[PDB]
Each structure stands twice: as structure tokens, then as C-alpha cells.
């Protein structure tokens, strides 16, 4: 299963089935053993948006990073595309980018052909954390230019849209 | 065709944005009223 099955005076997580229940019990929530079900459950995403907890950050980072690695190695497809679409949908929320996706894209961009999951890849570059334009170019924008100078004109318009979305987000 | 496609895409994204805004609203009033109740109780 791509998304782990959720396993549970703190409010029990299973009893969380309605929005008013979350409204009443937001203070006494308990962190799940696995937070993958947080992705497809918007109820826990509401508490995740403000929890700002250090351990759960690392726990979700390692989770999603190893999940991305195993999905990518198993691909070489529709389920992978759907999972990445769900990740992108969650990324639209929280108004901030993830780091597991950033590391995965850094690792896979040089190996990227430009057509495996282009739709999926180009929407992650939109949500890239703000950084000085002196470390990303040597690692990220070089291969971006490599593809840009040689790929299709429609791919050029595509990466233009991606970078303008990045500029808007920044 | 790209222009239409992005038009409906932006419309859908805007509707989703209002949905999220509405939900986080009652989230905010619930959090504020809970905080006030806890402050008054102590």
C-alpha cells in the first residue's frame, strides 16, 4: 500500500470523522504512528499546518523520501503518477514546499530524461524553498538549462510556466 | 487552447482556494474560542 493504513484525555484519531469533532478536539490531538494517511485525510492536515513539531518533520521526511525512492526504482506507472498527483495536491496546501521532494528531484534531475513524468516533475520545481541564487544553479539550474536548450519548444513554455510559478511562490 | 485550459484551471484553483479559506476560517474561530475558554478556566 502506497499510503499506510492508519493505526490510532487525548482524542482518539479513529473517532475523528467529522469537521466539528476536529474543531472541538484540536487541542487534545495525538500524533499518528504513521502520518502517510495525513496526506489523503485533510482533517489531520489542519493540525499539521500549525503543529510545527521537529520529530514529525524528520519522520515524514524519511518516510516520503524512501517512498519516493522505492516508487521510482519500481517504476523502471499510473499508480506512481497518481501518488505524485496526490503529493502535489497536498503541496498546494500548507503554502510551503517539502524537502523530500526537493532532495528526490535534485538526485533524479541529472538522470532525468525529461519525459518520464514531466507533468509531475515540473510542478514540484514550482514549490522550491527560497535560497540564494548561488547554490541551486550549480546543482539544479544547470541540468534545467541542459534540457531547456535541447528539448521541445512546448517543453520550453512548460519550464517557463514552472519558473514563473516559482517566482510567484517566492 | 492553452488559454482556455488555463482559464478553467485557474477557476478550479480559485474555487479550491475559497474552499480552503472557508474551512480554515471556522478552524480559526474554533481555535480562538478554545483558547479563550482555557484562559478563562485557569
Amino acid at each position: 500500500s502506497v499510503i499506510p493504513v492508519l493505526n490510532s484525555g487525548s482524542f482518539p484519531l479513529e473517532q475523528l470523522q467529522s469537521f466539528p469533532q476536529l474543531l472541538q478536539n484540536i487541542h487534545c490531538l495525538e500524533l499518528p504512528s504513521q502520518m502517510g494517511s495525513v496526506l489523503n485525510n485533510s482533517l489531520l492536515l489542519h493540525y499539521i499546518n500549525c503543529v510545527r513539531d521537529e520529530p514529525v518533520l524528520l519522520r515524514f521526511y524519511y518516510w516520503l523520501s524512501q517512498t519516493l525512492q522505492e516508487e521510482c526504482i519500481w517504476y523502471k506507472g499510473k499508480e506512481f503518477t497518481n501518488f505524485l498527483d496526490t503529493i502535489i495536491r497536498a503541496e498546494c496546501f500548507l503554502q510551503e514546499g517539502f524537502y523530500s521532494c526537493e532532495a528526490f528531484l535534485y538526485k533524479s534531475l541529472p538522470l532525468w530524461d525529461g519525459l518520464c513524468c514531466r507533468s509531475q516533475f515540473l510542478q514540484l520545481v514550482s514549490w522550491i524553498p527560497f535560497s540564494s541564487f548561488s547554490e541551486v544553479k550549480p546543482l539544479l539550474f544547470d541540468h534545467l538549462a541542459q534540457l531547456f536548450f535541447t528539448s521541445t519548444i512546448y517543453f520550453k513554455c512548460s519550464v517557463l510556466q514552472s519558473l514563473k510559478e516559482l517566482l510567484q511562490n517566492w | 487552447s492553452t488559454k482556455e485550459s488555463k482559464n478553467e484551471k485557474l477557476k478550479e484553483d480559485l474555487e479550491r482556494e475559497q474552499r480552503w479559506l472557508d474551512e480554515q476560517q471556522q478552524i480559526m474561530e474554533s481555535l480562538n474560542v478554545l483558547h479563550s475558554e482555557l484562559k478563562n478556566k485557569v
Binding site: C50, R52 | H35, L38, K39, V42
Partner: peptide
């Protein structure tokens, strides 16, 4: 940002009476 600050302060005070 406001919600993050509010949750931070409520959590800190809640641990404070504890």
C-alpha cells in the same frame, strides 16, 4: 502565521499549568 503563533502560545501555556 497568526494560527502558528496562537497554537504555539496555547501549547506553551497548557504545558505551563501542567
Amino acid at each position: 502565521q497568526a494560527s502558528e503563533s496562537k497554537l504555539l502560545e496555547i501549547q506553551t501555556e497548557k504545558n505551563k499549568q501542567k
